[PDB]
Symmetry: C2
């Protein structure tokens, strides 16, 4: 049970999909905006495609990424809604998500900015490596990229 935001986009051997669902509760406490003060839990579902250049087998979750989002109401007066997702696990597996408060029903544009593990902006840079030798190594990390979709929200 989830609500898709547009259709998934394929880049650098990965599938990037955007979805939302009801606000959630998460451990550790204090990271997510409280469910009672949110409208949705927005998610980025990122999985490896066949022949992924960073060594992930097809269908694997791509871990240690850092995702920033920008949600803008189309024809709205208000400014965009921005934030950072957090890596986490739910009953459907690991993902990147965040509890968001929107600006009522209507048309929205959503932009995700996806940072690789080595990006300056990624706080997980010192904790994740990549083999670089010819025998066991992989291609360099993909470069930071943005993906966008349109969606209509009505209250869930």
């Amino acid at each position: 049970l989830e609500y898709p935001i547009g259709t998934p986009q394929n880049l650098a051997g990965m599938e990037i999909a955007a979805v939302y669902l009801q606000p959630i509760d998460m451990e550790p406490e204090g990271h997510m905006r409280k469910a009672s003060e949110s409208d949705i839990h927005i998610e980025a579902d990122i999985h490896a495609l066949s022949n992924n250049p960073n060594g992930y087998p097809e269908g694997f979750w791509v871990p240690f990424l850092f995702i920033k989002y920008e949600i803008t109401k189309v024809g709205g007066s208000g400014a965009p809604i921005t934030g950072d997702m957090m890596a986490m696990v739910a009953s459907d597996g690991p993902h990147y998500g965040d509890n968001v408060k929107l600006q009522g029903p209507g048309k929205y544009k959503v932009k995700y900015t996806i940072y690789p593990p080595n990006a300056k902006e990624n706080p997980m840079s010192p904790y994740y490596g990549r083999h670089t030798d010819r025998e066991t190594g992989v291609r360099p990390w993909f470069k930071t990229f943005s993906v966008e979709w349109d969606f209509t929200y009505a209250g869930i």
Copy 2:
């Protein structure tokens, strides 16, 4: 090119396997002991079994763990070789590993201590969550555990 250390062990809906290979090169530099100054690249392969209680589908890599290792030469009289693995990716996928200097050919005992994402000892604790709500939540993280195996090293 991976050499097995004993047989994999199953615990809390996860398969825990130990392997080693020749030392590797890794980005970012300064984390791994240099390939020339090492004997092996030790690894912990941890994947979800069926009906994993933390929401991982079968075969998925279990991310954001922290592994400490203790390698003892059987009848060696030398002090145990200790260290922390690091999460990383190679051509066969993500894993936990480290470049290690051994104490020559012979029989060794290897002990891994596996810390869940919420362990005090785990440095990635503030970067990974777990849904706890009725609709999308998963069971609490497993408790820190250790696993041991014997292996005979002769060089590679």
